[PDB]
């Protein structure tokens, strides 16, 4: 964990503690605490549903500069002997 990443660590963990404390001090608190165990139940389920080796080769085909391989210079018309 580099210097730049640790600032993004407790710049996103101290966001949680700023905000998960902001869920208890509100009015409907247990309406909002059970809201977030349910909302992260799809963060779990999306991890084990999508095929990451098939989304990646879909986004590898998303751009024509990386999907189709290069055809710039054939090896004939480039030799010198």
């Amino acid at each position: 964990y580099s210097t730049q990443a640790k600032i993004a660590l407790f710049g996103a963990l101290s966001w949680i503690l700023y905000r998960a404390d902001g869920q208890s001090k509100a009015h409907e608190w247990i309406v909002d605490l059970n809201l977030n165990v349910l909302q992260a139940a799809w963060l779990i389920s999306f991890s084990s549903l999508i095929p990451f080796r098939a989304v990646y080769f879909a986004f590898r085909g998303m751009a024509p500069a990386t999907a189709s391989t290069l055809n710039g210079l054939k090896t004939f018309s480039s030799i010198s002997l």
Binding site: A20, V31, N34, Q39, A41, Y56, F59, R60, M62, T66
Partner: protein, 228 residues
């Protein structure tokens, strides 16, 4: 010397698929002759007075996703649920689709009346009916994004605000008759709210690309000497 970017990384390939999609929504008009090496000074100039619609959409699409994606991150709430952000991008497309109309005419406000004959009291109501159907193009574009992130979120409180009551009024061991069927109902709305949040942006920005792309109609200025 910012960063050595990888050549084929994932947000490089994800972004330029999006940008070549929105740029593909308003392509330039096929010109009135074969594109020579002398028509090129009118092709780079008709691609100059063209409004750069490809980045004005991707600005309003890589924001509306990344703001509504936070509505499905845990503990967080999407900033588009406020009225002060959702219609902050609602008027400012209808602003932008008006500034072009106030630029293709040269003036700063036209809108006056041209006369007619016997249907002239008939044609007097319609252009200030088109105006009130042009003014409500703004409010329609804003609140539509504001509700869909407050509609699936005011309900989803109360689905949580009832489903808890069955393990509250009844015991924790009593999940078998009803709770497991209801906890499957509640979870099946964040599955709905995911597909609304990914797609409300894709609606919102394709509306922006239609509502601007009816203003940048231009013409070529290379007919000066054809055959010689």
């Amino acid at each position: 010397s910012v960063r050595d970017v990888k050549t084929g990384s994932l947000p490089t390939n994800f972004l330029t698929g999006v940008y070549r999609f929105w740029r593909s929504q308003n392509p330039a008009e096929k010109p009135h002759d074969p594109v020579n090496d002398r028509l090129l000074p009118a092709v780079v100039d008709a691609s100059d007075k063209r409004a750069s619609i490809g980045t004005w959409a991707t600005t309003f699409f890589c924001t509306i996703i990344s703001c509504n994606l936070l509505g499905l991150m845990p503990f967080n709430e999407a900033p588009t649920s406020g009225l002060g952000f959702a219609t902050g991008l609602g008027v400012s497309v209808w602003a932008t689709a008006t500034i072009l109309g106030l630029s293709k005419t040269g003036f700063k406000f036209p809108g006056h009346f041209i006369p007619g004959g016997t249907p002239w009291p008939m044609a007097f109501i319609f252009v200030p009916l088109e105006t009130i159907s042009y003014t409500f193009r703004a409010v329609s574009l804003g609140v539509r994004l504001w509700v869909n992130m407050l509609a699936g979120h005011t309900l989803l409180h109360i689905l949580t605000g009832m489903a808890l009551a069955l393990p509250f009024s009844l015991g924790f061991f009593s999940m078998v008759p009803a709770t497991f069927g209801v906890c499957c109902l509640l979870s099946a709305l964040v599955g709905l709210e995911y597909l609304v949040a990914v797609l409300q942006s894709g609606v919102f920005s394709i509306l922006s690309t239609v509502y601007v792309g009816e203003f940048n109609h231009d013409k070529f200025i290379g007919p000066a000497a054809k055959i010689v």
